[PDB]
Ligand binder design. Sequence first.
Ligand SMILES: CCC(CC)(c1ccc(OCC(=O)NO)c(C)c1)c1ccc(OC[C@@H](O)C(C)(C)C)c(C)c1
Ligand SMILES: CCC(CC)(c1ccc(OCC(=O)NO)c(C)c1)c1ccc(OC[C@@H](O)C(C)(C)C)c(C)c1
Lengths: 10, 10, 239, 239
Amino acid sequence: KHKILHRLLQ
Amino acid sequence: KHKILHRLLQ
Amino acid sequence: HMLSDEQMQIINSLVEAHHKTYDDSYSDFVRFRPPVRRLSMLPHLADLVSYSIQKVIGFAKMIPGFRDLTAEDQIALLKSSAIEIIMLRSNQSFSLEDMSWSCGGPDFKYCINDVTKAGHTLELLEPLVKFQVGLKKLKLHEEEHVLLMAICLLSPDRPGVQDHVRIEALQDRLCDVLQAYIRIQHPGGRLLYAKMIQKLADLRSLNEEHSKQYRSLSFQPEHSMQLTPLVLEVFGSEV
Amino acid sequence: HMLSDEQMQIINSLVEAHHKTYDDSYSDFVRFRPPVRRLSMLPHLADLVSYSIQKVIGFAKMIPGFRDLTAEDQIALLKSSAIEIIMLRSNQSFSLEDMSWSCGGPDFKYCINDVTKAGHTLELLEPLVKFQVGLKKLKLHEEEHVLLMAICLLSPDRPGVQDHVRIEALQDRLCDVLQAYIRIQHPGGRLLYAKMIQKLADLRSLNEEHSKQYRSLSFQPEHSMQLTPLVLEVFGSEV
Ligand SMILES: CCC(CC)(c1ccc(OCC(=O)NO)c(C)c1)c1ccc(OC[C@@H](O)C(C)(C)C)c(C)c1
Ligand SMILES: CCC(CC)(c1ccc(OCC(=O)NO)c(C)c1)c1ccc(OC[C@@H](O)C(C)(C)C)c(C)c1
């Protein structure tokens, strides 16, 4: 899903 | 999935 | 009247399982990400809670009849009751003098304000502290405390439970034991049982409120990323 | 010959982004689960690595052109290069006297044996230390070190990369900058560039070996449960 990476990439 | 719980429940 | 063997063996099994899964020295707390007084206490409390879940699982596997249920039922009972069992075992370190949980050092002395820094509101913490105090006052014997936890974890009325009949029977037997013990070994415990069963009702409301607040937290990746894989699994809804 | 503006601005941007995402005091290490010398160093190193990923992401978002790519491409580049960038930034704390990484205190001084207690074999650690030493010897300027990291993270030849053309152009421009800088500002750096590009090749092999060993670890729940949600996401294969 990559929800954390998305959030961190702003 | 619960793979951790399964493992811990032996 | 007096207690029977396969009834006293149950009590010895539970008491021993609790001792085997509850560290009185709290020497594992130094291994958690250190406490820090947005949501500064989340890393520490997440590790505390993850570690407690592991203990609850160890305890559950030693409850007579639990290990024979289906993995699906064991998981359904654990996921829906884990927070209630954690709240019950935490009472052992609760102190009525400072309304806080003291686990060894001053670093590991949790105030209602600390939990606030882990993402929770007084909407939960207020009833929680009230619950802790009420329970602390019942001055339960180790035998009743452990029986209360096993009775809570073996509740057939939890979402996801399939073999509701076998679980109802396991919990009924645990209830007799608790009733017989209070009546025979607890001088002045005439009204105790009902007050204990009342505490299970209180836990349902705390569980419900904790789940809402946790859901809110788990939906924000900057916070969920601070949780552990076990906490995410047990409190998650991906059943 | 000399460097141009939009070429020197690139170098100033990268150097500043590195400073903004690399704590020389290592004061955040005390917040990680403490190191412990089955796989006793996994909790600490997992937190170290999770924290580094966050830094790499902060660095990436400041690489000119990176923030304009698609989220999918940004993620594809981050997931496939994260470990290589971590290995490059860790060289800053590598010491040729003790062949170890020293990050402030003696508690945060990592030996090749410590990584072993995090689930890795000499099959990886041997080439890794060899890489660290070789790179340490190139005595790169901060400008070349940071350029090497940006060039590595902007490699179009990574699985999952879609807009391979735009990424090829971003990395080509970063390469010119590095080549011009070594030629103009690095006395004795005649053979440097080729040796640096060689280091990117070495990283590919380390990345490959690290991925195998990590896959093995992630397949055992008693170990994967010690990882963080960010580490599981970035090193996971659920793209
Ligand atoms: C600090 C108080 C408490 C109380 C039940 C706790 C939990 C386990 C404990 O250890 C007892 C034991 O035997 N362990 O093995 C002790 C002494 C206290 C708690 C902790 C975190 C909380 O909020 C936490 C969760 O909402 C997250 C972090 C999001 C999952 C909430 C609402 C309450
Ligand atoms: C201890 C050495 C190292 C070397 C690249 C490291 C990583 C980040 C660091 O910090 C530098 C920095 O700037 N951070 O922001 C520093 C100084 C060292 C490492 C650590 C864990 C490892 O194994 C770990 C992984 O395999 C797991 C735990 C499974 C994900 C491996 C194979 C290597």
